[PDB]
Structures are given as structure tokens and as C-alpha cells.
């Protein structure tokens, strides 16, 4: 419920400058990254979190936060630390951890 | 009707190897296409040209040819010059520009 508001904020146009690498599942074939599925065992994106929210797949707020961070964790695991997507991941995670902390 | 033959030829299997990026409108919901409508203000594809022909929107051959080139113009503007799809647009445009010529 309050996670649904968090999901709207990550998908809001305000943060679209750095949240767009996570709007859809990673296409390992279109980006030249065939070893992505050898390294990443559990992909996650915001369209997948959104689908699992509308279908009610999260039992509580912690499962929601687990999927969101996994989407950030895969970026930290797969990309080099100086990569552009990691800078966008840090900023979007900074937005998440704030809205998720200041819940009731 | 000289344009209808041009439309069926671009949509035929003879050019399906490089004409498939233009069969349908660009899906801006793909991984990194969320900015297509911020950059391209007049989208165009071949399903709309067929739908503007079946609804009989084109008055003359200058109205038909204008939309087809806009569809190629959007591809050159949005995509990098070394991308395959611009090469696919260059290859397909030569087929169009000399049936219309």
C-alpha cells in the first residue's frame, strides 16, 4: 500500500533521468551482454515489481524492498563501479531508501 | 494506386530482412526507448500508412510520399548513424524513392 506510493515515485517522471535503466528487464541480447544471465541469477526491474504489485505478489513491505534492492544489487554485481548505470543506481536507491524509511 | 503498389512492395517478403523495424509503430516502452516521443514529434510507420490508405487519407502522391520519408527521417534522427536500423532504413528508402520516382 505505502509501497505502491514508493513504486509510483521510482516510476515518476521526476526521477526518469536516472531511473530508466530499470524500467524494463535487461535485454542481454540487444545490449551486447550475453554473459549477463551467467552472472545474474535473479533479474529484477520496475516493470516486474509493478506487475507483482498489481497482482499482489508481495506479502509485506519487506518483500517489496527485497526485489527493489535486488534490481540495484544486480547492477552493482554486473557493472563496473565507475559505470554510468551504477551512478544511476546509487541515486535511485538513495530515493528508495528514503521513501521506504519514512513510512509509518 | 501507383502508391498502393509501392506500399505492398515495402510490406512484401522481398524486403522483410530490413523492413521489419518499420512494420509497426516504435514501441517507446522498450528498455531504452522511453525518450522517443521527446525527440521525435511526428512518428510514422507502415501500419499507419496502410491505415491511412485504407481509410483513404492521402489526397495525392505527394501526401503519401511525405509520410514515408518522415518515417525514415525519424529513424535517422533518433538512431546512431552506425546502427543497423539506419542501414535498414537506407536500404529500404532506395526501394521506395525509385518506385515513386
Amino acid at each position: 500500500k505505502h509501497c505502491n506510493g514508493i513504486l509510483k515515485e521510482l516510476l515518476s517522471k521526476k526521477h526518469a533521468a536516472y531511473a530508466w535503466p530499470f524500467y524494463k528487464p535487461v535485454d542481454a541480447s540487444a545490449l551486447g551482454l550475453h554473459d549477463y544471465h551467467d552472472i545474474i541469477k535473479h533479474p529484477m526491474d520496475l516493470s516486474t515489481v509493478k506487475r507483482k504489485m498489481e497482482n499482489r505478489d508481495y506479502r509485506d513491505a519487506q518483500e517489496f524492498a527485497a526485489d527493489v534492492r535486488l534490481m540495484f544489487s544486480n547492477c552493482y554485481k554486473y557493472n563496473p563501479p565507475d559505470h554510468d548505470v551504477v551512478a544511476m543506481a546509487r541515486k535511485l536507491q538513495d530515493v528508495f531508501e528514503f521513501r521506504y524509511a519514512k513510512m509509518p | 494506386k501507383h502508391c498502393n503498389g509501392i506500399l505492398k512492395e515495402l510490406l512484401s517478403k522481398k524486403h522483410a530482412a530490413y523492413a521489419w523495424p518499420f512494420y509497426k509503430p516504435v514501441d517507446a516502452s522498450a528498455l531504452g526507448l522511453h525518450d522517443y516521443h521527446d525527440i521525435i514529434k511526428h512518428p510514422m510507420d507502415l501500419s499507419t500508412v496502410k491505415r491511412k490508405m485504407e481509410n483513404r487519407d492521402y489526397r495525392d502522391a505527394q501526401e503519401f510520399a511525405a509520410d514515408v520519408r518522415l518515417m525514415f527521417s525519424n529513424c535517422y534522427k533518433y538512431n546512431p548513424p552506425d546502427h543497423d536500423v539506419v542501414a535498414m532504413a537506407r536500404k529500404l528508402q532506395d526501394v521506395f524513392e525509385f518506385r515513386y520516382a
Binding site: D27, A30, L31 | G32, H34, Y78, N79
Partner: peptide, 11 residues
Amino acid sequence: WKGYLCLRKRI
């Protein structure tokens, strides 16, 4: 798969 933004996702 074909934009300028999606080149940033490339390593």
C-alpha cells in the same frame, strides 16, 4: 536496442 540513451547501458 537502438537509441542513444541505451548506449549508456553498454559495457
